[PDB]
């Protein structure tokens, strides 16, 4: 045994970490969706004559590391998850290029006063107040940010641990009421939590799927989507065309057509897209 | 959704499911949209008017 | 601060006059408040810490 008393002498931030060199994207930016038959297996339909139809039409551990039986190998890195929020047909594309929330209302709590429950709740789940982002619309949808909405029915729920390993869900990061109201404090204390502590239920590392993490003796992850409370967009094109017009000419890009559109990616990392050999930074 | 009370008591939160697609109200599915769905619908099963 | 008993290992001093009359009865029936017992192996100098 050997025991150390370490101390912080001066009252200045004397230890700065900086993300410098990217080495390896691991989690695929894949398309694989997440299936609530493995998150809520405790429920089913009332008639088993019909529940035995849908699971047919749609769809454990090993040495201390989680491992699904139905994939004996990947090729494109750790297979990510994808999630489902019903959204109105008349939502607006101009919301979607901007780093914002998957909710309707924005949710940056740091702007509110310290130690206020009511003054911090009025950002999230009210509607007489407009958005802090827009002002004509007061919420992008009252189907994922109404106080009782499906953005709350799905993911208010704290992580129920189970002997079977649960899988990660990124929409909990933006919907969980209690974890967001932890950031009520003044922002000097919000520095000192961001370094040493860790939030509720982040994703794994070196697995097959995106499980829940339960070890803490190895985890290193520092995700800043906890703190700043936004979600970046990447590429999409509702027809095949606008990917080609994205990579043919970037300056005279066509962002919107009658029925089709595009979102340019805005992310702290920037890659080299390589369809063929044309290169978009 | 709708809200109604018992006679002489507090209000309740009782619900229905909108069954057909047309029971989605207009500002979630405008009349130009629902018309443009039937034209996609027309060119799959190929009914000829 | 309510200054109470402490078991820290002082350099105690002892008088001449005895005290030991009626003590086994009196300390068991509240002669003085905040009394501390000693039962064999506990009767030693407490471990100092600070």
């Amino acid at each position: 045994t050997h025991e150390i008393a370490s101390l912080h002498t001066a009252l200045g931030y004397s230890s700065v970490i900086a993300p410098a060199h990217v080495a390896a994207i691991t989690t695929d930016m894949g398309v694989h969706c997440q299936d609530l038959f493995m998150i809520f297996p405790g429920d089913a339909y009332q008639d088993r004559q019909l529940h035995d139809y849908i699971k047919m039409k749609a769809g454990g551990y090993a040495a201390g590391v989680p491992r699904c039986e139905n994939l004996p190998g990947l090729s494109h890195g750790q297979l990510a998850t994808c999630e489902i929020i019903p959204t109105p047909v008349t939502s607006d594309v101009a919301y979607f290029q901007t780093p914002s929330n998957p909710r309707g209302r924005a949710a940056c709590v740091v702007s509110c006063d310290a130690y206020s429950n009511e003054s911090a709740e009025r950002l999230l789940y009210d509607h007489s107040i407009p958005d802090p982002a827009y002002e004509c619309r007061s919420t992008n949808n009252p189907w994922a940010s109404q106080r009782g909405s499906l953005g709350d029915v799905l993911y208010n729920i704290t992580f129920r641990q189970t002997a079977l390993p649960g899988m990660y869900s990124p929409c909990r990061q933006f919907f969980h009421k209690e974890d967001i109201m932890r950031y009520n404090r003044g922002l000097y204390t919000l520095v000192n939590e961001y370094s040493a502590r860790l939030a509720g239920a982040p994703a794994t590392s070196t697995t097959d799927l995106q499980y829940v993490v339960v070890n803490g003796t190895d985890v290193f992850l520092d995700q800043p989507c906890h703190m700043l409370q936004e979600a970046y967009p990447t590429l999409a094109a509702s027809h095949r065309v606008m990917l080609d017009e994205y990579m043919s000419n970037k300056q005279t890009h066509a962002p919107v057509h009658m029925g089709q559109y595009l979102i340019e990616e805005v992310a702290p990392m920037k890659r080299l897209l390589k369809l063929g050999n044309k290169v978009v930074y | 959704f709708f809200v109604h009370p018992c006679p002489g008591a507090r209000g309740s939160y009782r619900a229905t499911h909108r069954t057909m697609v047309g029971n989605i109200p207009q500002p979630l599915a405008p009349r130009e949209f629902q018309e443009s769905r039937g034209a996609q619908f027309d060119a799959v099963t190929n009914m000829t008017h | 601060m309510e200054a109470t008993l402490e078991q820290r290992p002082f350099p105690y001093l002892a008088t001449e006059a005895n005290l030991l009359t009626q003590i086994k009865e009196s300390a068991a029936d509240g002669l003085f408040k905040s009394f501390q017992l000693l039962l064999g192996k506990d009767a030693r100098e407490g471990s100092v810490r600070f």
């Binding site: 551990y61 040495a63 201390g64 129920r160 002997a163 860790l198 803490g216 003796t217 | - | 039962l39 471990s47």
Partner: protein, 321 residues
Amino acid sequence: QAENAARLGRQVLGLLPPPTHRVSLTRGPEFARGVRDLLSKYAASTRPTVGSLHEALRQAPFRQPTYGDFLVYSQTFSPQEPLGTFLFSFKQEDNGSSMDMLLTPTSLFMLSGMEAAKAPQTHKVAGVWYGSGSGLADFIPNLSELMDTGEFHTLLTPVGPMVQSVHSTFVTKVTSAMKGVGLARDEPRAHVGLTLPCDMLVDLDESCPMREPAGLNVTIYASLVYLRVNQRPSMALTFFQSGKGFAEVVAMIKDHFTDVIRTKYIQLRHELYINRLVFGAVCTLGTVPFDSHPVHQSLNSLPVLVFANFEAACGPWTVFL
């Protein structure tokens, strides 16, 4: 740093198990003059000089219990404990590779659903340590069924006290101890005793004057009773303590769970189920030197006993009825 190798040779070569007494022949009559720990009487001189009794102090018997390192889902084992609690190991299936579940005495109250009409003291206590009950029943959905047929007590292997805890938010490290008297990790030259909650203990020695002799021993016993509340299965842990030998205690425990038996067997009077006739069993946990005293303690409120010099000799369940 050259003197650092001394202190790892002082406290190491001096701390070794005593070797087997093996001496070659041809020196002669020497093999008796290494034998010291058999010698038990000493020269009681005029004044006891510590330089004259040092050999009666340097010698010692060979006392060392065994530690067992565990892993914990950090929900089952509450982030604080009074460091001397009692444990189990509810093992069902080799789920991962380094996976384990433990049970405190307050938790097994919470997993059960037994009422404050049997235990009105720690019901208020454990409500802040854990959830409303369903925080722990998520790990085992079999608790509606393992309690029906009474097969629950076959899976609890008792462990004993606690020694060391290295606690995090996600993984809780628990270093327990079997066979008993384990050195702490805060302070050397300490001995971590055992503690139990006052609600769960029921003692058996207290009587009118009216005579019973003592011994070297008093043997802390554990129990379980698969009773039924709200027409639902629900266990009943109690404790037992007596230095009275194993013969009496099974006859004595029926003087304790007396009225509970007369309530239940009216229910299965009208229906027969052979899986239901089991009632509960008795464990065995270790020995305490009788003539020792439990000092009361306090928490947030909660009275908790203590026992010094507990050693932990385990034992299995035997179904009394």
